[PDB]
Design a protein around this ligand. Structure first.
Ligand SMILES: CCCCCCCCCCCCCCCC(=O)OC[C@H](COP(=O)(O)OCCN)OC(=O)CCCCCCCCCCCCCCC
Ligand SMILES: CC(C)CCC[C@@H](C)[C@H]1CC[C@H]2[C@@H]3CC=C4C[C@@H](O)CC[C@]4(C)[C@H]3CC[C@]12C
Ligand SMILES: CC(C)CCC[C@@H](C)[C@H]1CC[C@H]2[C@@H]3CC=C4C[C@@H](O)CC[C@]4(C)[C@H]3CC[C@]12C
Ligand SMILES: CC(C)CCC[C@@H](C)[C@H]1CC[C@H]2[C@@H]3CC=C4C[C@@H](O)CC[C@]4(C)[C@H]3CC[C@]12C
Ligand SMILES: CCCCn1ccc(N2CCC(c3ccccc3)CC2)c(Cl)c1=O
Lengths: 124, 299, 62
């Protein structure tokens, strides 16, 4: 699906100008941040299916039961992205802030996934 | 034309050259362009700035459609929870452990649901004072009830200590309010003189420290829940309270940096406050009452 | 700098006024604009610009 979205468009990185800021010029990708809304929806559906299946592995032995360690991860990721979206909307400073915010969000999401999934197993 | 465009004489009175000055500057004299007060726009005749009406309030619109819908959904959810608690749980021993405490917690959650209606309304000194006091009062009620729940895992003493923990926060909020209740004033934005935003000018930072005092309370409740989750209270609710504590910790730790970052935009001020309050209320109600109603319907 | 001198009434003297800062192409009698993305601040008579989005290995935010 992302290739089908990618094939239609093409890498068009180039300088961009703003009417209210002419002394500074910046270059970025030619695709808007809303282009991956389909991928976001697909991931949301995948998370919903994961939660639904976790709701069915409830009555399982502790070794095979993880309905108290992966349900948190979906909620934590949802909170992370629903907090990143307003910051992205309000900042609108293409030079630095969006790169830092996205990198921090991705790194912390990976960290929370690791801590919720394997850190209890490493502890054992 | 005199449309905000003044004329200078190069070297003779008879000859003049007309050059437009700033659009926000008016003509005090024929040969002078001068700025006027903030929040006022120059008139077409360029003789005197007229005060722009304060129509930039958070009126009901597409932005406001979300918070009110979430508020009414939460009101329906808490009404259903309250009627289930009062219908098929008063006489059974399931709800006998924390009946009054759960009821006052539900009242606090309902007031927090009204809090989004307080936020969305137009600013005024009385409504600003009421909103500022409630923002501490409702959450103090909720988390004092949560802390008493944690300590339970005698009822009169618990109720009295919860009331005292509520009253100390009430007194702190009262002194904060007697400091500067009204706070109402005009707001001026650089390079945005066309738009004048009418909002309560009480410090967002001062509201932030009030919220972080309540956050220190949250952390106390969360560490207590994490300490006491090891031994259940024979009803398997200590772990549920602990999970609620961690989820609210997550919500607040999300809410503080985003608010600090977006302190500029007043619409995002009005929206994120409501979103966070509604999410906290939804998650606490779910994680603390959904298993209760599930076991009630199963039995 | 940033001021253009014009003398319509007479040649004896001119009433120089500062025009927009983003137009500095000529700067002898009238100020003219330059191309998009080119700041007219090179040799007081030309336009130049520097690339951005190169904060790789930057101490400020990277
Ligand atoms: C509207 C905002 C949020 C609303 C409500 C949030 C739901 C809870 C928040 C954190 C999840 C932890 C679950 C509580 C643990 C417990 O108490 O029990 C856990 C129970 C069952 O496990 P168990 O019975 O075996 O006991 C375990 C003993 N330790 O849940 C489940 O695994 C059921 C499967 C998950 C279904 C709901 C999960 C929702 C996550 C994503 C939803 C999207 C929200 C988007 C918000 C922006
Ligand atoms: C998967 C489900 C549970 C997510 C629910 C998210 C809800 C609570 C919130 C999160 C972000 C919110 C959106 C944020 C911004 C806008 C733009 C505004 O002009 C209209 C409302 C709208 C579109 C909001 C609607 C409600 C919203 C979608
Ligand atoms: C897990 C939760 C807390 C994540 C919330 C969203 C992420 C993207 C938040 C968490 C803390 C935030 C940072 C907090 C403070 C600042 C300093 C400010 O001058 C620029 C924005 C910046 C650098 C924020 C960027 C966005 C940020 C990294
Ligand atoms: C996404 C928005 C609408 C919020 C919806 C939250 C719902 C789906 C969640 C929140 C809390 C959840 C409950 C939390 C704990 C338990 C106890 C467990 O033994 C069975 C599932 C049960 C009863 C969950 C069912 C689903 C539940 C009610
Ligand atoms: C809940 C599922 C999480 C996984 N996830 C999260 C975000 C995500 N983005 C696509 C769109 C996002 C975005 C879109 C518009 C404005 C701001 C931001 C930015 C990045 C993907 Cl593509 C993903 O897959």
């Amino acid at each position: 699906i992302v290739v089908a979205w990618l094939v239609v468009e093409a890498p068009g990185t180039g300088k961009e100008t703003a009417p209210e800021r002419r002394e500074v010029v910046t270059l970025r990708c030619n695709h808007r941040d809303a282009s991956m809304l389909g991928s976001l929806a697909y991931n949301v559906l995948l998370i919903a299916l994961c939660t639904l299946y976790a709701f069915k592995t409830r009555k399982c032995p502790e070794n095979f039961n993880e309905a108290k360690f992966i349900g948190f991860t979906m909620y934590t990721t949802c909170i992370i992205w629903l907090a990143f979206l307003p910051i992205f909307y309000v900042t609108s400073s293409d030079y630095r802030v969006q790169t830092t915010t996205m990198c921090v969000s991705v790194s912390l999401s990976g960290s929370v996934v690791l801590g919720c999934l394997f850190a209890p197993k490493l502890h054992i | 034309a005199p449309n905000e465009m003044k004329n200078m004489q190069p070297g003779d009175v008879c000859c003049w050259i007309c050059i437009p000055c700033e659009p926000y500057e008016y003509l005090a004299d024929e040969f002078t362009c001068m700025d006027c007060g903030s929040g006022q726009w120059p008139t077409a005749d360029l003789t005197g700035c007229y005060d722009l009406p304060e129509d930039y309030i958070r009126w009901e619109d597409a932005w406001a459609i979300g918070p009110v819908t979430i508020a009414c959904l939460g009101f329906m959810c808490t009404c259903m929870v309250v009627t289930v608690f009062i219908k098929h749980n008063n006489t059974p021993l399931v709800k006998a452990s924390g009946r009054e405490l759960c009821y006052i917690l539900l009242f606090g959650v309902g007031l927090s649901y009204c809090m989004t209606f307080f936020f969305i309304a137009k600013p005024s000194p009385v409504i600003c004072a009421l909103r500022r006091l409630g923002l501490g009062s409702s959450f103090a009620i909720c988390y004092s009830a949560l802390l008493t729940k944690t300590n339970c895992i005698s009822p009169s003493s618990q109720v009295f200590i919860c009331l005292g923990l509520i009253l100390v926060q009430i007194v702190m909020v009262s002194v904060w309010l007697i400091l500067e209740a009204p706070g109402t004033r005009r707001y001026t934005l650089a390079e945005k003189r066309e738009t004048v935003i009418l909002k309560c000018n009480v410090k967002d930072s001062s509201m932030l420290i009030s919220l972080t005092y309540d956050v220190i309370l949250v952390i106390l409740c969360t560490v207590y829940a994490f300490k006491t989750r090891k031994c259940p209270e024979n009803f398997n609710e200590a772990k549920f309270i602990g999970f609620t504590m961690y989820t609210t910790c997550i919500i607040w730790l999300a809410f503080l940096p985003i608010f600090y970052v977006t302190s500029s935009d007043y619409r995002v001020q009005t929206t994120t406050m409501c979103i966070s309050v509604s999410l906290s209320g939804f998650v606490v109600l779910g994680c603390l009452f959904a298993p209760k109603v599930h076991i009630i319907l199963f039995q | 700098n940033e001021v253009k001198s014009v003398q319509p009434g007479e040649v004896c003297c001119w009433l120089c006024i500062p025009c927009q800062p983003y137009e500095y192409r000529l700067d002898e009698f009238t100020c003219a604009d330059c191309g998009l993305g080119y700041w007219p601040n090179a040799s007081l008579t030309g336009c130049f610009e520097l690339p951005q989005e190169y904060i790789r290995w930057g101490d400020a935010w990277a």
